[PDB]
């Protein structure tokens, strides 16, 4: 699926490992710590589409597929995918080719997309570097296609970024030498194939930045699919320059002042506002961006804050940002692990409850924006306008004149006061009435087009036209 076809779709993102096992069981030990297999499958994901599909997501990505170094390491399996060995075989804990085409299959029946994450950058191997044998990994069976071993010291030196190695003495991540004629061929005849056995949407790719940017044309072009890169750096002049060499990358930008604004009730929404005009202005096309405030990478969002209020309004910025919502398995759940491994935890042993709050909240934000882009083919591509921000709250607007979504956020928190915030700039005529979607209450725009937003709770407020409404399944 193209770069424009994506930017309609929210994604559910999931560790193959930890989201859902064959037998279906809720109680099955996963303990973090270990760091091991936990029995998660592809037919495990099948097997629980309507929980990802109840919530309103359109599509899941899933961690590598490809065949891992086989050791119980010092810090554990590769049950994450991250260290491949053989990226012509499957991992076989996930299932076989037939599960994983079976997957996809599932996914299409139900009009969503699959995207799988993929590493080009490097190979996994237990061991120090000067134990490693090049022969293991297929088809790169020799030191010659690796760069010489080093590892990254200097993060400001991009060459060093690129040249040398991620990982450590204990587990050594080889680093494929991508300036090879050999090497990119490879890649590229292996990610379109790929991508064809599998009839994969779009694709993940991890480790951006560790790769020089004259790789990534080519193997955008050989997917043939959106590509959103992982580029790990919060400055939008090292990071949205990525967006010229490859479809999307994830926002980091937006991930840092966002995380801040909303885990504290002193967060600041300066700080979001401005980033959200700096990426807006500043990266090649905010709207294939992938915004998120939880991955397997950072602590959880619950880890800062176990207040329900502000995961909620952190939730529906994800949503409602232009982009691509992202939401990782056990946000919606309220997980609050922290650092990996401890943002690793099973899905499962949650008992996939259909009823939790943010399983509801992100139901709602999810149902209007799909309503939404349903009958406003502009809504994707109108850029997000931050029109109001205070000490404790941030309001937004996206869509069509007329058809806009009018976000309105906060960081006071469960313990919020009740007051009326008399927001201007929201772009609705006098006497309009608007729908807050989320609480499905009514808001009516002044004679002077001002909107008085009820404010309690410290909770999150999505209003729509009321009018524009008609025939949804929303506020019934
Ligand atoms: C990207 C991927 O998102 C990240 O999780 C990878 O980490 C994996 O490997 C490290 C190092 O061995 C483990 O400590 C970790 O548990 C495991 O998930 C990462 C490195 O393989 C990927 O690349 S990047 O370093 O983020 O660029
Ligand atoms: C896809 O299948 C083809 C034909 O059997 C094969 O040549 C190729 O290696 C496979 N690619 C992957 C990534 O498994
Ligand atoms: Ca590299």
Redesign the pocket.
């Known amino acids: 699926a193209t770069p424009a076809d994506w930017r309609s779709q929210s994604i559910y993102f999931l560790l193959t490992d930890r989201f859902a096992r064959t037998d279906g069981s809720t109680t099955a030990t996963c303990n973090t710590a270990d760091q091991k297999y936990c029995g998660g499958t592809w037919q495990g994901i099948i097997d629980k589409l309507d929980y990802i599909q109840g919530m309103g997501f359109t599509a899941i990505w899933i961690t590598p597929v490809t065949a891992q170094l086989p050791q119980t390491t010092a810090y554990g399996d590769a049950y994450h995918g991250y260290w491949q060995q053989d990226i012509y075989s499957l991992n076989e804990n996930y299932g076989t080719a037939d599960d994983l085409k079976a997957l996809s299959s599932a996914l299409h029946e139900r009009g969503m997309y699959l995207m799988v994450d993929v590493v080009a950058?490097?190979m996994g191997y237990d061991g120090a570097g000067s134990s490693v044998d090049y022969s293991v990994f297929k088809p790169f069976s020799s030191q010659d296609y690796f760069?010489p071993f080093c590892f990254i010291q200097n993060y400001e030196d991009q060459t060093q970024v690129?040249?040398?190695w991620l990982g450590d003495n204990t587990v050594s991540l080889p680093?494929?030498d991508?300036t090879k004629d050999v090497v990119k061929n490879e890649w590229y005849d292996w990610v379109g194939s790929l991508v064809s056995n599998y009839s994969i949407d779009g694709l993940r790719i991890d480790?951006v930045k560790?790769?020089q940017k004259d790789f990534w044309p080519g193997y955008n072009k050989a997917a043939g699919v959106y590509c959103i890169g992982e580029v790990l750096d919060g400055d939008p002049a090292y990071t949205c320059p990525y967006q010229n060499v490859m479809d999307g990358v994830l926002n980091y930008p937006i991930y840092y002042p966002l995380l801040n604004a909303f885990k504290s009730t002193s967060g600041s929404m300066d700080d979001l506002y401005n980033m959200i005009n700096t990426v807006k202005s500043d990266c090649p096309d905010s709207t294939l961006l992938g915004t998120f405030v939880e991955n397997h990478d950072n602590p959880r969002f619950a880890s800062y804050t176990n207040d329900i209020a502000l995961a909620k309004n952190v939730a529906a910025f994800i949503i409602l940002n232009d982009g691509i919502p992202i939401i990782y398995a056990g946000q919606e759940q309220h997980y609050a692990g922290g650092n990996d491994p401890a943002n690793r935890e099973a899905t499962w042993l949650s008992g996939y409850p259909t009823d939790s709050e943010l399983y509801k909240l992100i139901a709602s934000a999810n149902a209007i924006r799909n309503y939404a882009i349903s009958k406003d083919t502009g809504f994707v591509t109108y850029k997000n306008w931050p029109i109001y921000k205070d000490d404790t709250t941030i309001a937004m607007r996206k869509g069509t004149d007329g058809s806009q979504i009018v976000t309105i956020l906060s960081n006071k928190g469960a313990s919020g006061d009740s007051y009326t915030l008399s927001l201007s700039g929201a772009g609705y005529t006098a006497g309009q009435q608007l729908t807050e979607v989320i609480g499905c209450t009514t808001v009516t725009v002044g004679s002077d087009g001002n909107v008085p937003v009820p404010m309690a709770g410290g909770l999150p407020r999505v209003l729509y036209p009321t009018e524009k409404l008609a025939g949804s399944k929303i506020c019934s």
Do not use: A, G, I, Y
Request: hydrophobic residues 15%; proline residues 0%; aromatic residues 0%.
């Open positions: 950058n490097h760069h690129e040249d040398c680093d494929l991508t480790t560790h790769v």
